[PDB]
Design a protein around this ligand. Structure first.
Ligand code: TD8
Ligand code: TD8
Ligand code: CA
Ligand code: CA
Ligand code: MG
Ligand code: MG
Lengths: 852, 845
């Protein structure tokens, strides 16, 4: 009504654009949604109060600033950000006049759209019947990624690490990372050399590459990497993060680094349907600001072609944008029109600037379209006739941008034509040279087992064990240890000097000795600092102040004061399995010289990371030549705590095992666990280790080891009873042999002692995979009067080691294992019964059968 | 002049950021939480005409007291306005009777926990102490649902106060919870292998204390795997809504079945399935009309601080992805908690959208009742030890307000304590049963079932593909599918894709509800299904099988065809379909993977629900998993449905596992599954290239006069001029490799070799297999042949079980397969072809 009323209506209008302007922005190059674009006129020329300091601006000028910033080809979502300094930063860079690119920069963008579109048309011409998951309709991704990388080089960063799905993957490999065209062309020809034909392999749009990006207008260079992935969309997201964090830790940058540059940048590409539908996206975003996982912000690019094969976005998500999940971490989101390559390159540079300023994730939603079917052989008008009727009228971004550069007089029609002829002439020359190569004979894929051959002294000095023991009592000045934590630290110093070392200390003796030798040790998982079973105490919390103390971190310094090079990185993970296991797998790939251990609360929850186990951990070497030394610690054992607190599903890991891809163990003694970890960290082999770890056996007084087992011994794949190797036991009295693995040994041994059964022997198989054939055959030959052999296990008949051992043992060793029978629980649907009482009755039946 | 503009920006600051200043944490852990207009402006009237003092007092009460409101992220302005109007007004104080009722809820909640502490000090119970307000809050949710006249509230929750909720909300007898702690279960409770006490469910009828309405209250079973039950709950509710003719597939838009989903703060932010389930909230094939979420935010995850649990301010920030309003409420204010719970139900009823309540509280004891939390959280537990619980604090406010006396409050606790002791003593007095090992559930559900249909039924389903609406324009490449199907229905040579629709269509015609979903399932990954056809000119949809829901005389059959394109999820989508089948046991529920290689994204559902739910909880599901499978040279992720993993999981006849080789056999497998009366999941390994194999077709008689065949012989012996006595080598197989072996046998005229197919992989068809092999008396060698690597396919289980169940028939059985491999296959189609030819050469060499 009045001046005070009018000025208040302007402030509401200013906030509506900043909050909701993106809903009116011309971001969709297809204009599919018809209803998208659903105070007096005398007040437009009046001057209003604006806090920008405070200045007086005409309503028309305020309005035009808001429309240009928020309602053109860029939809900006940032008012959900809780940090006011971040809202101010974006608001200042978005609500100002943007400097137009130079003619040279515009021409360079055009060259990126030329290379992008002519690569996809050349492939449509030469290999019309092969899938390539074309980037056609989304060519703007290439100048956009180029701008991200160029802006990272402009900030003087060290590396950009990419992860992406199928969409434009080959295009990115060739035009961004620098994968030779000849290599891509040789893949389509299906003529691979012995190096490319190694292992079982994988499809062309799953492969990675490395290279050096050189600035076109600047004087800096930056490393560009692209990591391998399975078909399983978004599964590589935590793997990328782990890989980057491992690289950042090595360059002394980021969270565990001297500077706060986070000089290794994750550039993560996504499809619009997969970004909203896959849970691992939220799991990986949730890691973005965590101390144990932060990479200083990820640059996310969503190639939003408004389709998921035949599925419309309406059936893909319950939200306006495919990127709305990124709001959970307060990430700014830029929705940009794919037909405006200049707006796309500008948003990409703004994204990198935001990441560098706040060490936080940024999401770019590139609205585009998919010119062809889902694959190049699919007909999309069957399911999307309206969308494909609009695409057929649509001139590509390259043709449109070419017509803009000719209009602006920047280039001629001849220069534009000649540049396309040059590019297609170059591809034809390389395609012909590749086709001219002599064709190799196709042979069946071969096992990778022999690609990595085992050398190994894992025994340490008594002074080493004592130093790790002393570290547990080398408390900072005035530190107050919790009264129930103090006996663990004192009992460990006692263990290190007097023996009877339990499982929990043997683990820290292994990790501590590696740190002392200069190894980087990364240990993480749910409540891993203290330990689920209050056993580890890798970090101790001051009772009065809350201050933390990490005893093994003292092993990173030599007694002469110099560093060993080693480090202890121990964290409490978020409540995730998929992202946490993926991250640790990626971390080991990123730093092959690191000791990387991930611990499940109980092995029963590792099935939440099944895609990582199946697609990365068990098969990555055979498929991509990608090596990982990740350790999975899986608390396992029948103790009456129910079907979810019992099994790490040993049978599933043994089923997945082939070609010596992983080591699978279930050690029964602390010393054997110690040597297993040291062998894994020192063998020079990069292969995952699956360890089935104890729960109650952690506090079993029989399950302790002598100092000489650490100082003058090595890993034992097969273990005999101490009464035969160190005692006065007679092996020739044995008629029944019991073959087992894990904690059930101690129960069988206690029953043997109670009944003085000299006729029965118990042999433990510590290394489940690869089977210790030679050592097992030698061991059995030491018992010549054996008339019957039984595989004994607490696990149901369809679980544990029996499904694989019952088939493999009589086949690999027919002389020793023909007639081998099973003693176990019945086959069960669940890993165990829900009642502790019923567990006890079943457990006693097993030992009665084994001795009856 | 500028003042009125600062007032509007200030109003906006409270609505936008006021929740960051709200006194929501009952522990006040964060010390720094509470950090253009004059004091003269407070009495002046401003444009929103209201005085500044009244404007600020309304903004403080609504946004900065015990309730933190997040709603300005909501894109629908009418939803922001709805919240605004209900939050920025004077709230009517509860009556003395209502306050007393809230106190009775906190009394029951806290005394149940202190009683279990006293009697069973050494047993885990994941106590609700420090979070007791959850009970009056859930009561308010359920009471508000009854006030809206809804039919049922279905709950899913984790361990935190599960026992308490069961006893004080659902109405599970105290005697039953006490018998569980005693460890003395009757034959009915000791059935199957079972599960732990805080995994079990219950059902009951809630009766309003002050109203005249009643509502059903259910609590569903779940594993330890936190949040895994979230999509299962949604599926269960959607199946119930579809039965009540409410919701998306109902005549009314009431969605009268309400999901009430409880969460722990660390699991809500860390588990991806949360985002996957939220993503389903407004989808046509999955919407339940909004879920009421209650996060029991005790600001701890066992020993893990929230700083290591999430990268955001609140544990509930993932719910912003679907524009859900979030209410952060102080757990020490049970009245604010009950009021927010009723507001939540009112928002769900108005907008058919999810609402999230973040109940800020604390965990009085350790993670479990035996854990010492001061080892890792000494500051937090030093603050908890000074804190008086919510029950004692609310009691003191009620004696202060003059509402109750100290005697009435004391006497009410003595009454509750006396009642619990009386029930505990009666339970302890019961005769103790002998503990025996758990038994297989195989015999709990016992199966000659006629699955054949009349030819007039095949013809009707064929005609339905051509019974197009007036003026409908079929895509030129879709029209031959429709016409070839009407030809197939009358002339035979029925392919796989049509045999599927013949099965689903005949069930619909018989009155069955059919739900089919998965990624690109309406058209089909291999462009073969066309369950829905899209008008080339208008985009309008036509579903041919939906015509089978009406009889020729115009009356309905009772059947329905619900076919959807799922979101790009496996975990949530498989969980949802499992829960749908549990919710409606009379429905035919099929979920289809794009390729079986992606079902490992739903591994927790397969492991924790599908394969073991019957043995653990007595929870039955008839869910069908369709898994496209087969070695064709498309790489390690487009080849295997990991058959070896499903066979490994199989035990106690929990599931049926099949790999049919013919359309007719697939048809009868689906019809047997839908008509057998048994509620057990069906795992089907389905074809890709075999869909278009001209040898893989069936006759009309195979549908009208035959039945499911667990084992199949070559047609040359059953219908041709082949001599079984000439056979010396027998090849045992399953799936598409049969046709390749059969083509090699014909090419070489190998009468000495026979190929026998095992269609039903689990349970193994012992009798038929032995009866079939007995027809080949001159067999000198038997081989299990498979295209899958040695450590994959059926060999790992069959190589061990076949010589054991049939020693006379299978002793000396050898394997013909690919070598053991880390990946399900090679990446090169050329290398695949070389390996495939080696198998064929070995089998015939
Ligand atoms: C977990 C999981 N569940 C299912 C699939 C099957 N699936 C995909 C392919 O099979 C892999 C493609 C090629 C390969 O790598 O082998 S793509 C697709 C459409 C995705 O669309 P979007 O909108 O995200 O991307 P676009 O529009 O396509 O750019 C679906 C459903 C999968 N790969 N992973
Ligand atoms: C996927 C998955 N990964 C790990 C676990 C192990 N885990 C849990 C238990 O084992 C389940 C409890 C016992 C049982 O049901 O058997 S609770 C927990 C802490 C919960 O934090 P929160 O803040 O969310 O809950 P509260 O504060 O406690 O109310 C973790 C880590 C799991 N069950 N599921
Ligand atoms: Ca190694
Ligand atoms: Ca059934
Ligand atoms: Mg897409
Ligand atoms: Mg918690």
């Amino acid at each position: 009504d009045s001046i005070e009323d009018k000025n208040a209506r302007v402030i509401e209008l200013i906030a509506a654009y900043r909050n909701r302007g993106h809903l009116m922005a011309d971001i969709d190059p297809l204009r599919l949604d018809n209803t998208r674009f659903r105070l007096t006129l005398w007040d437009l020329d009046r001057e209003f109060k604006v806090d920008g300091g405070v200045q007086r601006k005409k309503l028309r000028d305020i309005l035009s600033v808001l429309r240009d910033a928020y309602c053109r080809h860029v939809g900006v979502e940032y008012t959900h950000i809780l940090e006011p300094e971040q809202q101010r930063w974006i608001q200042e860079r978005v609500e100002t006049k943007h400097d137009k690119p130079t003619v040279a920069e515009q021409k360079y963008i055009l060259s990126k759209l030329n290379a992008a579109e002519a690569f996809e048309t050349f492939l449509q011409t030469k290999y019309v019947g092969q899938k390539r998951f074309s980037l056609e309709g989304a060519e703007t991704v290439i100048p956009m990624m180029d701008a991200v990388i160029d802006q990272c080089a402009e900030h003087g960063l060290d590396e950009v690490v990419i992860a992406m799905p199928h969409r434009g993957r080959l295009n990115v490999l060739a035009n961004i990372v620098g994968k030779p065209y000849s290599q891509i062309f040789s893949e389509f020809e299906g003529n691979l050399n012995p190096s490319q034909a190694h292992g079982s392999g994988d499809v062309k749009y799953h492969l990675g590459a490395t290279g050096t990006y050189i600035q076109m207008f600047g004087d800096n260079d930056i490393e560009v990497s692209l990591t391998a992935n399975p078909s399983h969309l978004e599964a590589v997201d935590p793997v990328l993060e782990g890989l980057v964090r491992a690289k950042q830790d090595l360059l002394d940058t980021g969270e565990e680094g001297s500077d706060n540059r986070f000089s290794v940048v994750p550039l993560m590409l996504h499809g619009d349907a997969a970004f909203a539908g896959q849970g691992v996206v939220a799991e990986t975003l949730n890691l973005a600001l965590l101390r144990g996982y932060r990479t200083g912000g990820t640059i996310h690019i969503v190639v939003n072609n408004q389709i998921g094969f035949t599925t419309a976005p309406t059936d893909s998500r319950s939200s306006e944008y495919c990127t709305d999940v990124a709001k959970m971490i307060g990430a700014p989101i830029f929705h940009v029109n794919g037909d405006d390559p200049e707006a796309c390159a500008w948003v990409a540079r703004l994204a990198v600037d935001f990441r560098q300023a706040f060490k936080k994730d940024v999401v770019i939603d590139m609205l585009c379209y998919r010119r062809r079917g889902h694959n190049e052989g699919d007909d999309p008008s069957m399911t999307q006739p309206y969308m494909y009727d609009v695409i057929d009228t649509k001139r590509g971004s390259r043709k449109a941008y070419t017509e803009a550069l000719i209009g602006r007089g920047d280039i001629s029609m001849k220069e534009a034509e000649d540049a396309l002829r040059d590019y297609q002439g170059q591809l034809e020359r390389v395609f012909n040279e590749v086709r001219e190569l002599e064709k190799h004979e196709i042979e069946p894929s071969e096992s990778v087992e022999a690609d990595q051959q085992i050398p190994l002294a894992t025994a340490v000095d008594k002074a080493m064990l004592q130093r790790i023991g002393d570290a547990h009592l080398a408390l900072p000045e005035g530190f107050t240890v919790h009264p129930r934590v103090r006996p663990v630290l004192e009992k460990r110093r006692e263990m290190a000097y007097e023996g009877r070392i339990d499982w929990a200390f043997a683990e820290l003796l292994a990790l501590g000795s590696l740190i002392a030798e200069g190894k980087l040790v990364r240990l993480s998982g749910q409540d891993t600092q203290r330990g689920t079973f209050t056993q580890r105490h890798a970090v101790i919390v001051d009772r009065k102040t809350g201050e933390e103390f990490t005893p093994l971190q003292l092993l990173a310094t030599n007694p002469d004061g110099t560093p060993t090079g080693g480090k202890f990185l121990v964290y409490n993970s978020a409540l995730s399995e998929f992202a946490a296991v993926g991250f640790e797998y990626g971390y080991s790939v990123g730093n092959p010289d690191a000791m990387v251990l991930w611990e499940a609360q109980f092995g029963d929850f590792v099935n939440g990371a099944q895609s990582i186990i199946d697609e990365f951990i068990s098969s990555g070497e055979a498929k991509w030549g990608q090596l990982s030394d990740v350790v999975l610690l899986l608390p396992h054992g029948h103790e009456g705590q129910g079907p979810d607190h019992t099994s790490g599903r040993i049978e599933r890991f043994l089923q997945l095992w082939a070609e010596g891809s992983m080591t699978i163990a279930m050690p029964s003694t602390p010393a054997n666990y110690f040597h297993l970890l040291r062998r894994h960290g020192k063998d020079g082999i990069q292969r995952p280790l699956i360890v089935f770890t104890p729960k109650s056996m952690l506090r079993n007084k029989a399950a302790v080891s002598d100092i000489r087992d650490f100082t003058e011994s090595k890993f034992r794949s097969v273990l005999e009873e101490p009464m035969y190797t160190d005692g006065e036991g007679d092996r020739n009295k044995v008629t029944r042999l019991l073959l087992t693995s894990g904690k059930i040994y101690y129960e069988l041994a206690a029953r043997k002692a109670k009944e003085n059964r000299e006729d029965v022997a118990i042999v433990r198989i510590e290394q489940l995979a690869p089977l210790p054939r030679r050592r097992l055959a030698e061991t059995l030959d030491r018992y010549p009067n054996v008339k019957e052999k039984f595989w004994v296990q607490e696990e149901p008949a369809n679980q544990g080691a029996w499904p694989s051992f019952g088939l493999t043992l009589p086949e690999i060793l027919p002389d020793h294992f023909t007639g081998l029978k099973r003693i176990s629980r019945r086959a069960m649907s669940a890993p165990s019964s829900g009642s502790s009482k019923v567990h006890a009755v079943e457990q006693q039946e097993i030992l009665d059968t084994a001795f009856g």
